[PDB]
Amino acid sequence: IRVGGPYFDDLSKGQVFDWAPGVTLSLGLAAAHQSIVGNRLRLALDSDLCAAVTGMPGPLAHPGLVCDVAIGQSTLATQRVKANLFYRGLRFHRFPAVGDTLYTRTEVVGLRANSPKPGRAPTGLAGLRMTTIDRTDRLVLDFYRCAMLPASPDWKPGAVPGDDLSRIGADAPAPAADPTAHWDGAVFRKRVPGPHFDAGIAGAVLHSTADLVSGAPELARLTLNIAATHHDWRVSGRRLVYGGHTIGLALAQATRLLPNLATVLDWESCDHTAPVHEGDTLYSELHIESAQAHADGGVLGLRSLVYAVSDSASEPDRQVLDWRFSALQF
Amino acid sequence: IRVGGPYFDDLSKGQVFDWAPGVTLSLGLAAAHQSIVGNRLRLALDSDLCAAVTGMPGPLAHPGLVCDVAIGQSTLATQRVKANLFYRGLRFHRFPAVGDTLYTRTEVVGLRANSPKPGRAPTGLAGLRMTTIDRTDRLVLDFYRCAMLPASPDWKPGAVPGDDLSRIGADAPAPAADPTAHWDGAVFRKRVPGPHFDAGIAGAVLHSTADLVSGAPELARLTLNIAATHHDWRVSGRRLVYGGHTIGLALAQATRLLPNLATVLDWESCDHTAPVHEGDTLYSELHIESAQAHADGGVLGLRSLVYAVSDSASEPDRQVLDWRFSALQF
Amino acid sequence: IRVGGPYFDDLSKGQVFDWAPGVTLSLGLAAAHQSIVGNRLRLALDSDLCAAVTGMPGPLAHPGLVCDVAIGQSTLATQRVKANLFYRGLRFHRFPAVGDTLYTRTEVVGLRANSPKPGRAPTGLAGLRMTTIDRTDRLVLDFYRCAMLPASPDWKPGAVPGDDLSRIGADAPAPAADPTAHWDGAVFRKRVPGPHFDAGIAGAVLHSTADLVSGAPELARLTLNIAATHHDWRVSGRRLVYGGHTIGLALAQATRLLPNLATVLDWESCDHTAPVHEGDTLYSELHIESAQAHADGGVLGLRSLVYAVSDSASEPDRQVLDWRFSALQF
Ligand SMILES: [Cl-]
Numbered sequence: 001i002r003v004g005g006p007y008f009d010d011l012s013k014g015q016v017f018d019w020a021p022g023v024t025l026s027l028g029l030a031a032a033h034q035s036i037v038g039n040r041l042r043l044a045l046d047s048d049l050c051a052a053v054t055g056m057p058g059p060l061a062h063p064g065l066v067c068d069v070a071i072g073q074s075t076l077a078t079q080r081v082k083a084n085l086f087y088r089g090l091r092f093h094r095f096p097a098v099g100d101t102l103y104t105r106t107e108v109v110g111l112r113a114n115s116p117k118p119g120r121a122p123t124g125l126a127g128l129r130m131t132t133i134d135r136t137d138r139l140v141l142d143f144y145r146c147a148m149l150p151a152s153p154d155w156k157p158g159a160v161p162g163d164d165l166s167r168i169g170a171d172a173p174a175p176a177a178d179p180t181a182h183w184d185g186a187v188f189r190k191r192v193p194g195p196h197f198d199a200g201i202a203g204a205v206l207h208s209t210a211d212l213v214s215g216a217p218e219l220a221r222l223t224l225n226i227a228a229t230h231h232d233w234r235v236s237g238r239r240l241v242y243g244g245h246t247i248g249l250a251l252a253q254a255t256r257l258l259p260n261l262a263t264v265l266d267w268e269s270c271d272h273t274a275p276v277h278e279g280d281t282l283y284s285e286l287h288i289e290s291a292q293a294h295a296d297g298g299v300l301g302l303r304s305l306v307y308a309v310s311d312s313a314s315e316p317d318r319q320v321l322d323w324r325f326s327a328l329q330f
Numbered sequence: 331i332r333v334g335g336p337y338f339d340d341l342s343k344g345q346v347f348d349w350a351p352g353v354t355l356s357l358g359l360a361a362a363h364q365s366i367v368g369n370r371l372r373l374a375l376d377s378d379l380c381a382a383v384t385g386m387p388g389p390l391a392h393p394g395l396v397c398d399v400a401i402g403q404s405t406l407a408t409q410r411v412k413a414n415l416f417y418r419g420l421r422f423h424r425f426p427a428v429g430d431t432l433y434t435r436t437e438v439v440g441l442r443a444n445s446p447k448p449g450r451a452p453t454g455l456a457g458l459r460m461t462t463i464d465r466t467d468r469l470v471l472d473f474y475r476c477a478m479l480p481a482s483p484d485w486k487p488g489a490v491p492g493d494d495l496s497r498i499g500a501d502a503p504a505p506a507a508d509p510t511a512h513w514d515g516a517v518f519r520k521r522v523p524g525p526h527f528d529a530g531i532a533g534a535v536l537h538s539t540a541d542l543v544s545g546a547p548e549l550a551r552l553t554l555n556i557a558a559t560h561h562d563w564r565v566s567g568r569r570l571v572y573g574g575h576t577i578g579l580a581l582a583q584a585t586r587l588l589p590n591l592a593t594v595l596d597w598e599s600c601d602h603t604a605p606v607h608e609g610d611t612l613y614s615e616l617h618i619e620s621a622q623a624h625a626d627g628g629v630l631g632l633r634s635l636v637y638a639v640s641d642s643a644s645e646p647d648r649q650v651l652d653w654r655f656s657a658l659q660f
Numbered sequence: 661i662r663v664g665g666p667y668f669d670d671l672s673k674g675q676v677f678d679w680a681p682g683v684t685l686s687l688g689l690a691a692a693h694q695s696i697v698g699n700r701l702r703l704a705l706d707s708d709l710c711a712a713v714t715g716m717p718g719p720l721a722h723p724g725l726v727c728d729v730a731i732g733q734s735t736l737a738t739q740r741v742k743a744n745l746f747y748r749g750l751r752f753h754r755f756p757a758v759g760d761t762l763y764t765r766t767e768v769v770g771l772r773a774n775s776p777k778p779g780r781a782p783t784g785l786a787g788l789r790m791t792t793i794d795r796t797d798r799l800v801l802d803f804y805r806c807a808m809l810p811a812s813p814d815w816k817p818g819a820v821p822g823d824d825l826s827r828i829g830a831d832a833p834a835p836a837a838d839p840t841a842h843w844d845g846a847v848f849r850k851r852v853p854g855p856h857f858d859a860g861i862a863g864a865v866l867h868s869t870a871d872l873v874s875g876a877p878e879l880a881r882l883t884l885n886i887a888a889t890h891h892d893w894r895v896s897g898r899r900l901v902y903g904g905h906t907i908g909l910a911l912a913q914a915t916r917l918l919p920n921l922a923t924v925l926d927w928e929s930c931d932h933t934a935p936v937h938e939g940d941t942l943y944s945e946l947h948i949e950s951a952q953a954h955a956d957g958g959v960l961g962l963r964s965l966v967y968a969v970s971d972s973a974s975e976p977d978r979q980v981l982d983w984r985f986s987a988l989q990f
């Protein structure tokens with residue numbers, strides 16, 4: 001594989017990138033991740049509660065950390081990325097503990113050359129499937145993204161890698177088993193102040209407080225993310241903040257709004273609406289789209305619109321991200 | 331409780347905020363804390379010495395980390411804070427180990443509406459008592475602060491929450507037991523180069539080297555501190571640095587000056603003299619006000635004046651903080 | 661020893677600074693270090709692979725972290741430093757595990773007053789020997805640096821500390837034993853995708869992707885580095901980035917280029933060509949100078965030229981560092 005990463009025309013449908021380092025989750029990584037994007041997930045902060053609830057071999061790896069590690073691992077293929085158009089179908093098949101080691105395979109699922117346009121660099125889109133497992137060979141995540149890559153300088157433009165990429169990561173199999181089935185919602189309800197799960201909150205629209213985007217290159221280094229645009233301002237003209245950082249702050253915002261979320265069960269990004277830069281201040285509008293009771297608590301469906309604060313009272317704030325996720329709540 | 335935190339007129343004398351997440355202290359949190367404010371406390375850095383000295387179930391949680399976690403926990407009540415006028419009566423009742431989990435209760439002890447003043451936002455002061463315990467229900471900290479909060483937009487100003495707040499956190503009970511009684515000062519003296527404790531140093535006035543204020547929002551995220559002014563520049567016009575960060579650097583300064591301090595036993599802030607901002611460079615003048623011999627070493631009483639460096643040789647530096655603490659020294 | 665550190669004329673040939681705190685290596689420190697300079701060393705990231713390969717009592721402390729801690733420890737003597745002219749003869753005598761504690765002795769090996777020059781501050785050079793051991797008294801590192809220090813304000817200039825410093829840290833004893841002799845290269849080759857060691861790569865010249873210099877004061881605080889120029893802009897006029905940070909990014913660059921390096925065996929800096937500042941963007945030219953087969957894999961000799969990116973397409977990039985190291989590769 002080329003130094004600096006593949007160009008679009010270096011890739012093939014079915015090609016596999018599996019030489020990414022394994023990464024052992026530690027409370028070290030957890031703390032650094034928390035200092036950058038925040039962490040108010042009670043099971044990820046309190047080991048005694050985590051043990052009472054999950055009985056887990058160790059404390060709960062923050063789900064945003066697990067996702068960020070899997071996505072940063074996969075950037076071997078996409079060091080040359082100009083933009084990811086979406087992340088899709090992240091659903092946890094299990095929730096790793098601190099001390100578990102994650103290994104991520106990246107497969108090219110589909111390739112489509114972009115139509116030539118005057119003044120634009122030749123580029124194509126790569127549909128990528130990431131499969132993240134642990135040392136026990138159990139599936140953790142199996143998810144998709146759509147990466148725009150430049151073609152090599154002498155590439156002969158044409159149409160023919162021309163895969164249909166529209167439906168990438170759909171009808172994707174649900175997990176074999178409920179990843180929280182062994183979690184005891186009853187001790188959570190007893191030890192954590194309510195309100196606990198209530199299907200009556202569906203429909204609510206909440207407005208978060210703001211966070212600063214800072215430590216963005218640190219988050220990328222922490223999670224092995226080597227997409228050049230996060231590190232090197234000359235790729236896009238300014239460094240572009242990793243999508244997961246913006247998502248991470250939006251999740252922290254949602255958790256200040258809804259302090260009793262147990263975990264994130266699945267998520268995807270709907271629109272990366274505008275670029276985010278280091279030093280931006282973000283807030284979100286949180287829609288509770290659905291609330292479904294289960295035998296033990298229930299599951300909220302959330303949709304988060306994230307905005308960057310403009311530099312004055314006389315300039316409108318701008319939408320930068322639209323994403324959606326589901327969360328378990330006891 | 332209101333989204334975004336209570337206004338001054340949402341509070342009541344005797345009201346309790348106890349739904350803050352528990353936080354398990356980890357060497358992860360310790361390392362992140364150290365990268366932001368520094369750490370030269372020998373018992374917090376060296377696990378072998380810590381074990382020889384304290385015999386402790388695990389290594390020594392840096393006392394500034396423990397305080398910062400307890401204060402960040404308590405910011406649930408004070409997300410809307412305009413200023414804390416002081417922190418008072420922090421005295422450790424025990425020194426938690428890595429792996430211990432901290433839980434903090436915040437009680438409204440007193441409320442006083444501020445007198446209307448033309449051009450100023452309607453506000454009041456809240457005297458707050460924080461009680462921090464571990465999972466074993468043992469008292470760790472029991473301390474006070476005075477927070478200024480805005481009143482809600484339609485509040486009818488008056489005098490009557492009008493509690494006398496002047497003496498908040500005084501005649502506060504000393505710990506039941508000496509929190510360092512089981513620490514072996516003799517192995518410390520044998521293994522660490524002197525000078526060791528000497529009552530003759532009382533009266534000394536020392537001048538520190540400088541530190542940069544950086545990673546301020548990170549320290550806040552790390553310690554669950556969600557006071558909006560640390561994150562959102564539009565609350566005050568610029569983000570204001572958390573008081574504990576400034577104190578943390580002043581403590582690091584004192585520990586470079588006095589490398590053999592065993593721990594901080596108690597502390598309080600005397601005047602938050604001027605705001606501190608990210609990118610400020612601070613130094614301190616350290617007064618050793620008292621030095622009292624005990625059966626095993628002694629206790630220093632310290633008073634620290636902290637200054638921000640101006641941007642030229644022809645502009646005076648400005649005092650930003652005056653605080654005082656006591657430290658055990660073998 | 662003087663508050664703020666010794667001046668050049670405070671030092672003596674044979675003087676010893678051994679009151680630096682011991683520092684226990686933790687996965688906390690490892691994570692913070694990784695967030696600042698990156699970490700792609702497979703044995704430092706993956707505990708399961710580390711155990712299979714080394715059998716080690718715990719996971720592998722990143723070698724750049726170990727070096728940075730030893731060098732930051734030693735800054736007690738050099739708080740007043742104006743420049744280190746080189747670091748020399750770092751060779752690992754063993755590779756510490758997480759949980760091991762490092763203790764560093766700094767000895768003045770040689771002193772040479774600099775010749776007076778009009779308009780320049782009076783200064784001298786100190787040749788320093790650092791010896792880093794663990795709690796088991798085993799040698800970890802035994803290395804050298806050349807620090808330029810100011811003389812005190814009333815110093816009487818002369819020639820006589822006038823030691824010959826040119827050959828400091830040469831003919832330095834190789835380790836008693838191969839520090840990786842018990843590492844199993846065969847399981848590494850089986851579990852990590854090739855290419856594995858190939859003497860045929862000697863001669864290659866590779867060009868890295870770029871990294872941002874950020875969190876520089878954090879790296880210094882993390883590793884107990886109290887050289888004032890890293891913290892206080894008024895010493896040099898701007899804060900100067902610690903040499904180890906630049907080296908750390910150059911090593912991260914080399915590891916993206918050569919993803920299967922097992923560890924760094926030794927290193928030294930050849931020229932600190934120009935200052936580096938926070939916010940610089942760096943890339944490197946990596947020369948594989950030598951490749952020598954051993955019974956288990958082989959050892960690469962690398963020379964790294966590091967450059968700072970200029971602020972436009974019409975300004976040349978500038979060399980900031982030239983260093984060289986050797987690495988084991990299975
Ligand atoms: Cl373009």
Ligand SMILES: [Cl-]
Nearest residue numbers: 449450451452
């Ligand atoms: Cl006002």
Ligand SMILES: [Cl-]
Nearest residue numbers: 779780781782
């Ligand atoms: Cl000069």
